[PDB]
Amino acid sequence: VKNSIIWFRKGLRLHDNPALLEACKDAKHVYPVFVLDPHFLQQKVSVNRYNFLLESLEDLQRSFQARGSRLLVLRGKPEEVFPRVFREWGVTQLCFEHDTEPYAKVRDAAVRRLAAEAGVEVVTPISHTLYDTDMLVARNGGAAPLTMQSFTKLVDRVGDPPAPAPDPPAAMPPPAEDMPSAAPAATGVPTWQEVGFKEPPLTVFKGGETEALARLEAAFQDPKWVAGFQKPDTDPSAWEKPATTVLSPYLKFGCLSARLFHARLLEVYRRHPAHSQPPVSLRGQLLWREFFYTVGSTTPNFHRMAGNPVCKQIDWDDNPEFLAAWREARTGFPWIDAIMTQLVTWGWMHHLARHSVACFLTRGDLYVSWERGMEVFEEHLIDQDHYLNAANWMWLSASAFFSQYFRVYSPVVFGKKYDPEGRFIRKFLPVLKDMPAKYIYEPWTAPLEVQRKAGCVVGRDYPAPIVDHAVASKACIARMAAAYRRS
Ligand SMILES: Cc1cc2nc3c(=O)[nH]c(=O)nc-3n(C[C@H](O)[C@H](O)[C@H](O)COP(=O)(O)OP(=O)(O)OC[C@H]3O[C@@H](n4cnc5c(N)ncnc54)[C@H](O)[C@@H]3O)c2cc1C
Ligand SMILES: [Cl-]
């Protein structure tokens, strides 16, 4: 008989799941499995993103139970767990979504070898991305494109991505009864308290495929807003209703299919001939995701500077003091400190908000390495994506893809153009709620009588600016200029 395992790593969904569809075909028993490492916190990861994963698994558990099945959260390492469940469950086929991250290829290759030793067939369909990334590289002559312009001409030469896969059947072959490794006491979804966390998550974005599909429909309630979407014109100070979709944590964990997103976009574009085009359109935003995935998966040492062929070697400063202030949101610039508070609270910020803090830390003011800023984002972001977090950090530091190091965001002026009253700042920095709008971006410039009135004294209740932007930016620009001439 056919007993199959559908291995969940990314792609935490039932829609557009070709790996799940293959595992259910002519199957007597199907074992949905997520392999959890109970020693992950005893190695880095916030409770916000880890609880987002756990919520995403609870949603899978409910979806499987509605179809007569059950999600199994096995404990341990994959190389030590699968060889046992292969013989115990009588497995003949192992299916999982293909993943191109560096750690995935080593993990998957070892699992492939273990499956071959147990006589288990392996099926690895591509569904986390729009296209077969290796196919894009081969069609381009063996090398990936290094610009969005040329990459967009490539995907237009290949055509539309594959349509989303159909939905799985309403009834699924369940796991076999009375199997010791499938016992409910050892395979349930744990809570964030049981995995070692001590403080509760504070984010407002819930995990799971059902929430992903709900937020997708919410984005498509107005087709005119979808067709006329232009990324650089959106508002980074909007928090009550974010100016963008906030689908990135669902796309990172696979809770929402990218091909489904792209299929829904084409349906709206077909009825609106004046829709925006890449790179600024919503379709272009998934193409940015596809572009960084293609270049990152084929570039050695893509998450670092040394040994990275596309990253410029800049002599960034080893300044732990500036890094600490930036990390702990006490730089003295309320626009920067509020975004860093939104990072640790929600775990998500608007794209232009991430530009402000990443430019400030690197080529703009502090001259700290983008690697150090990356390690801060990898901890707190709930959409933390390997290839995307680096390519955008290398973009903001002018180490790759981007090279206009004379464009330096002002930490005082940038947020003033969108939000003159500073409503975004009072929400996340309530110490400044009563500060008048004239000084909310420059609190150190307010008279002492005003600071005492507003209950916010600079140097006592809120810190002073760590640097003078006029002095710091002119110095970083000169250093980046000499680094570009020596390269
Ligand atoms: C320093 C820095 C770090 C970043 N790190 C991440 C990260 O770890 N994970 C992440 O998903 N994005 C990252 N981005 C891109 C950007 O922060 C988010 O993709 C976006 O702000 C999420 O909002 P949204 O889902 O509403 O995006 P939308 O505007 O709705 O875009 C739709 C989708 O396209 C993708 N996308 C959008 N912008 C980009 C981009 N610039 N590059 C690649 N894909 C993009 C995402 O999957 C997103 O969900 C980073 C950007 C910067 C400047
Ligand atoms: Cl500016």
What Rg, from alpha-carbon coordinates, does the chain have? 24
Q: Are 408 and 361 in contact (CB under 8 A)?
A: no
Q: Are 70 and 189 in contact (CB under 8 A)?
A: no
Ligand 1 mean position, distance from CA 79 (Å): 32
What the block records as the tokens of 120 is 């288990």
Strand, coil or helix: 67:
coil
Neighbouring-strand partners of residue 33: 7, 72
Q: Percent helix, strand, coil in the chain (nearest 5)?
A: 45, 5, 45
Residue bearing the CA closest to ligand 1, atom 44: 289
Q: How far apart are CA 277 and CA 289, in angstroms?
A: 16
Q: Is 385 in the pocket of ligand 1 (CB under 6 A)?
A: yes
C-alpha closest to that of 29 among 178, 187, 189: 178
Q: Are 248 and 381 in contact (CB under 8 A)?
A: no
| Domain 128-164+209-299 bears CATH identifier 1.25.40.80 | yes
SS3 string of the chain?
Answer: CCEEEEEECCCCCCCCCHHHHHHHCCCCEEEEEEEECCCCCCCCCCHHHHHHHHHHHHHHHHHHHCCCCCCEEEECCHHHHHHHHHHHCCCCEEEECCCCCHHHHHHHHHHHHHHHHCCCEEECCCCCCCCCHHHHHHHCCCCCCCCHHHHHHHHHHHCCCCCCCCCCCCCCCCCCCCCHHHCHHHHCCCCCCCCCCCCCCCCCCCCCHHHHHHHHHHHCCCHHHHHCCCHHHCCCCCCCCCCCCCCHHHHHCCCCCHHHHHHHHHHHHHHCCCCCCCCCCHHHHHHHHHHHHHHHHCCCCCCCCCCCCCCCCCCCECCHHHHHHHHCCCCCCHHHHHHHHHHHHCCCCCHHHHHHHHHHHHHHCCCECHHHHHHHHHHHCCCCCHHHHHHHHHHHCCCCCCCCCCCCCCCCCHHHCCCCCCHHHHHHCHHHCCCCCCCCCCHHHCCHHHHHHCCCCECCCECCCCCCHHHHHHHHHHHHHHHHHHC
CATH 1.10.579.10 in the chain: give the residue spans: 300-485
Q: Is 212 in the pocket of ligand 1 (CB under 6 A)?
A: no
Q: How far apart are CA 262 and CA 278, in angstroms?
A: 13
Task: For 193-216, give one letter per residue: b (16+ CB within 10 A) or e.
Answer: eebebeeebebebbbbbbbbbebb
Ligand 2 mean position, distance from CA 235 (Å): 14
Q: Are 258 and 286 in contact (CB under 8 A)?
A: yes
Alpha helices in 172-208, H assignment, sequence order: 184-187
Q: How far apart are CA 94 and CA 27, in angstroms?
A: 12
Task: For 101-123, give one letter per residue: b (16+ CB within 10 A) or e.
Answer: beeeeebbeebeebbeeeebebe
What is the domain class of 1-127 according to CATH? alpha beta
C-alpha closest to that of 351 among 245, 220, 481, 486: 245
Q: How far apart are CA 125 and CA 199, in angstroms?
A: 38
Q: How far apart are CA 17 and CA 64, in angstroms?
A: 14
DSSP letter assigned to residue 361? I
Q: Are 428 and 237 in contact (CB under 8 A)?
A: no
Instruction: Please name the helix (run of DSSP H) or strand (run of DSSP E) that holds residue 18, with its range, or none.
Output: helix 18-24
CA atoms within 13 A on the CB side of 103: 5
Q: Are 259 and 17 in contact (CB under 8 A)?
A: no
Is the C-alpha dihedral spanning 411, 414, 420, 422 positive or negative?
Answer: negative
Q: Which atom of ligand 1 is nearest to the CA of 378?
A: 8
Burial (Cβ within 10 Å: 0-12, 13-18, ≥19) of residue 185: exposed
Q: Are 417 and 234 in contact (CB under 8 A)?
A: no
CATH 3.40.50.620 in the chain: give the residue spans: 1-127
Q: Is 399 in the pocket of ligand 1 (CB under 6 A)?
A: no
**Greatest extent of the chain over all pairs of C-alpha atoms, in Å:** 82
Q: Is 384 in the pocket of ligand 1 (CB under 6 A)?
A: yes
Strand, coil or helix: 338:
helix
Write out the binding residues for FAD. Answer: 231, 244-248, 285-292, 348, 351, 354, 383-385, 389, 392
Q: Is 248 in the pocket of ligand 1 (CB under 6 A)?
A: yes
Ligand 1 mean position, distance from CA 351 (Å): 6
Resolution in A: 2.0
Q: Is 52 in the pocket of ligand 1 (CB under 6 A)?
A: no
Write out the binding residues. Answer: 231, 244-248, 285-292, 348, 351, 354, 383-385, 389, 392
End-to-end CA distance of the chain: 62
Under CATH, which architecture does the 300-485 domain have? Orthogonal Bundle (1.10)
CATH 1.25.40.80 in the chain: give the residue spans: 128-164+209-299
What the block records as the tokens of 290 is 């596809």
The residues, any chain, with a CB within 8 Å of residue 206's CB and separated by 6 or more, are 52, 55
In this structure, the strands spanning 29-36 and 93-96 are: unpaired
Rounded to 5°, angle at Cα 29 from 23 and 34: 65
